[PDB]
From a paper:
Bacterial cells use several evolutionarily-distinct genome segregation systems, the most common of which is the type I Par system. It consists of an adapter protein, ParB, that binds to the DNA cargo via interaction with the parS DNA sequence; and an [name], [name], that binds nonspecific DNA and mediates cargo transport. Each chromosome encodes its own segregation complex, with Chr1 encoding a chromosomal type Ib system, and Chr2 encoding a plasmid-like type Ia system. In this study, we have reported the structure of the ParA2vc protein, in three states: apo, nucleotide-bound (ADP) and in a filamentous complex with nucleotide and DNA.
As indicated, the presence of slowly hydrolysable ATP analogue was required to obtain stable filaments, suitable for cryo-EM analysis. Using this data, we were able to obtain a map to 4.5 Å resolution, by helical reconstruction. ParA2vc forms a left-handed helix, with a rise of 28.68 Å and a twist of −80.57°. Density for the ATPγS and Mg molecules is also clearly delineated in the active site. Our structure of the ParA2vc-DNA filament reveals that each ParA2vc molecule binds to DNA via two interaction sites: (1) In the central [name] domain, three regions (residues 322–328, 345–353, and 376–382) interact with the DNA backbone. (2) In the N-terminal winged helix-turn-helix domain, the loop between residues 74 and 80 is inserted deep into the minor groove. In the structure of the ParA2vc-DNA filament reported here, adjacent [name] dimers form extensive contacts, with a surface area of ~1500 Å2. This interface is largely mediated by three regions: two helices, located at the C-terminus (residues 325–339 and 381–405), and a helix-turn-helix motif from the N-terminal domain, forming electrostatic contacts. Specifically, helix 1 undergoes a striking conformational change, merging with helix 2 to form a single, extended helix ~15 Å from its position in the structures obtained without DNA. Helix 1 forms a cross-dimer interaction, in the ParA2vc dimer. As a consequence, the angle between the two molecules in the filament structure is altered by ~30 degrees, compared to the crystal structures described above.
Numbering used by the authors:
A (entry chain C): 4 to 407
B (entry chain D): 4 to 372, 375 to 407
C (entry chain E): 307 to 407
D (entry chain B): 52 to 102
The structure:
């Protein structure tokens, strides 16, 4: 009988070996051939905030040192992002993990979870993270997590850079099981070695994910077969959170459009709550279902966790000029005001261009594209004022949630 | 110390069930008080493919009965959509199934599936199905399954026109869950009298979806803990498909954006896959990831389906002028030609009106209001339907033989 | 010595795209020699008449030359170009076979 | 924030009265600001207070 459907299943194969090809050419085509945006003595002022006098003093102190400054084709000064973070390293400006006021802090775990497909969590959240990383005055050690097995956050120009030299790896899955060589114990040095990777920024870091992570849900069903205390919830907490809380301060986490055991652990173990969403009716209805589903499930999780300290909703794909969606936003501000961000993330062709070349808004400048300037200008400025207002929620709660 | 947290979540939920009721009231205000815009007796010749003499023969056979062809503000025969269905039902034109040559048919079991979301599952499926409905010459019977827990086809101008004769409108999950009176069994009679409801299209019904569906993911996780035989896949097929194929010619399974036990069940059950993946470069990256994940998963499955039959990736919200996205279409065509649909679903404000107003592309006419904009909207949608349904023959001849 | 032609396909033309009989014929063709017949459609409009009467192919003239049979010519040239790349993609997949015969 | 169908309903309810929607240099309906106020006053949309 299933002669032609041996043909047909091994022709889903004889097409996904051609898609194995296709990914080979995708890798060959994405390859970097780019330079990071320069600060032009005014963009430097706007972004870093260093005064011209102190900047001159520091760049001279470094100029007499080993490193040499560089200039554009014109004698006008131009300093690269690498040179930027180097001058920050040598600025002596301490971070939240070096400030005498507060240096022994735990991670500020920030998450982006929506149960609605394709509406913006990936792109908006990676944009938000790369913008928060623009806080060069403070050198945040940031961990981007692409917990969505299909996110491009390991590939999208803030990526998990798995060069050819990269030998082997053990994803969050294998941290949920300790499937590394049984002889070696998973210590934080191992975590730097094969879990924490750079993102072409000397400050921003990441974790990668893989479609094999979907097998985690099957293994969790198997564990429910072998367990009944729902103890897999704490598997994340001890394996990952206790091992990472010692030596980082922020962890960007994308989770995916889905609500699943993996995403249940992401929800629970995390000590902060953010809720991405759009202004559409059905989306907010799904959020209603979400607000019914949670409380009982949190009751299911161990009583040791005293609930998440703050809850806020997000906009996205917000055209800002459609009557229905602004009415929805008004209703949200009417119901959970002070627990929803005011900031708006608009949609424009500039984001499309950014995505198609994979390059985040910061990676490209006006010369790269057309005059979708002010659109990108107000996009990055809303994302940065939104980053400081979410981090100001976190500031006012650096009394509460750090002591629980 | 989660008192604050939980009671506050219940307080959002309490003020927001009010928003749910407000949406229901918005429906009540918006509930049609009207039906599908009728045909003009020339669109009869165009889409129903009946020559003038044949249509006069049909109305000579019909009109002398008690029926009256209701006229609009003018004497022009304003044949209602149901009126047209009845007319050509008894006119003597054999249906696509009842026609003697093709009566041992394997119905289409179509899929729109992409583990990456926001690509246009439900609206592509519903536009395609609705346009397929209006091929009258052979009076196609169509079937559309909203299997998304957050799905919103229920009131979507395939709406809740629910004859209260049904015990309750049980959602596709609640057929899977068996949230039914235990007295009745799963039989075509039970489905007919208790499950599916009319949708302004006598050629269509829907299998519904309510928010509590999400917990069935957990339920089937507990089931997979109960047993590892993976036989859960056959639940959908055996229980529902075999009994619902009786009354319809084309079946569509909207798997939804998830990759959850539900959607492995569907993937296995579904035997023909459209992939409405808006070709945008990062969408295409997520669908290359799609095209690693599915070969492995399908390889894992047992040996009782005839795989899939074709893929016609229809680029959703397409523009044809955006330099980057039209170039992306070119890479579509080049990297993976010979397996993609040439025409497109152009992005138009008509489609956003379709979405937010809980409507379909066809149930509102030009008079409903746009103009040229939506005119070209359904022109493109209906050319795409022609092309699609031609593919449907092209592989359906394979279906009858399997 | 000639080992037959490597591929056979049929074309549409003058395809009004809205006549029941002709779409039924196209369905029957797709039913019989599917994968060996192009899906693309060549519609008929007054723009082609204007093109012919001045001899000028659609590309030689623009909107300022004629009336607003724009979208008709737009979709005509776009169907012809996607059809050109799909026939040349038949030829691509057969640049293994028919070049070596 | 009125959909096209709602605005045509409003002008179907209004225009048959003595009012004329004044056109500009072209036939394009140049609804004056007061004209818009009246239109949506009696169109059936409840005000922020009267609702
Ligand atoms: N500003 C924007 N401009 C253009 N496309 C956008 C924009 N925001 C979101 N998108 C869409 O989102 C797609 C990819 O981003 P995401 O929406 O994050 O996908 P995702 O990971 O499924 O997140 P969700 O589920 O939509 S919240 C793009 O291909 C677009 O279709
Ligand atoms: N032109 C459009 N107008 C409005 N919404 C659109 C449009 N194109 C895509 N969408 C999105 O699609 C949703 C409804 O259609 P679907 O895409 O089928 O929803 P779905 O079941 O979540 O499948 P996904 O996740 O979008 S692939 C809307 O809520 C939007 O998020
Ligand atoms: Mg996503
Ligand atoms: Mg599907």
């Amino acid at each position: 009988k299933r002669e032609q459907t041996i043909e047909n299943l091994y022709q889903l194969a004889q097409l996904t070996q051609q898609v194995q090809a296709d990914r080979i050419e995708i890798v060959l085509e994405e390859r970097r051939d780019e330079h990071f945006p320069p600060m032009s003595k005014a963009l430097m002022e706007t972004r870093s905030g260093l005064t011209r006098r102190k900047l001159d003093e520091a760049i001279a102190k470094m100029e007499e040192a080993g490193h040499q400054f560089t200039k554009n084709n014109a004698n006008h000064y131009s300093i690269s992002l690498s040179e930027a973070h180097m001058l920050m390293d040598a600025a002596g400006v301490p971070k939240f993990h070096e400030r005498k006021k507060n240096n022994e802090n735990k991670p500020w775990i920030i998450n982006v979870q929506n149960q609605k497909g394709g509406t913006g969590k990936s792109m908006t959240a990676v944009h938000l993270a790369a913008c928060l990383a623009l806080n060069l005055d403070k050198r945040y050690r940031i961990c981007l997590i692409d917990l969505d097995p299909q996110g491009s956050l390991r590939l999208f120009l803030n990526p998990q850079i798995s060069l050819a030299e990269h030998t082997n790896i053990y994803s969050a899955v294998d941290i949920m099981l300790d499937n590394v060589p049984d002889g070696v114990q998973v210590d934080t040095e191992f975590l730097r070695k094969n879990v924490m990777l750079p993102t072409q920024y000397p400050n921003l870091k990441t974790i990668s994910a893989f479609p094999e992570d979907a097998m985690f849900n099957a293994e969790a069903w198997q564990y429910l077969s072998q367990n009944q205390s729902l103890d897999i919830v704490r598997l994340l907490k001890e394996k990952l959170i206790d091992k990472i809380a010692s030596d980082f301060d922020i962890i960007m986490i994308d989770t995916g459009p889905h609500v699943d055991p993996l995403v249940w652990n992401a929800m629970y173990a995390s000590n902060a709550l953010l809720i991405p969403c759009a202004a559409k009716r059905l989306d907010w209805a799904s959020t209603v279902n979400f607000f019914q589903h949670l409380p009982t499930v949190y009751e299911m999780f161990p009583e040791d966790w005293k609930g998440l300290e703050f809850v806020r909703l997000m906009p996205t794909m917000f055209e800002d000029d459609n009557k229905k969606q602004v009415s929805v936003l008004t209703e949200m501000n009417y119901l959970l005001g002070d627990q929803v961000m005011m900031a708006t993330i608009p949609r424009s062709r500039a984001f499309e261009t950014c995505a198609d070349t994979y390059s985040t808004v910061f990676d490209l400048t006006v010369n790269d594209f057309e005059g979708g300037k002010k659109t990108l200008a107000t996009a990055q400025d809303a994302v940065q004022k939104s980053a400081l207002e979410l981090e100001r929620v976190l500031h006012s709660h650096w009394s509460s949630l750090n002591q629980g």
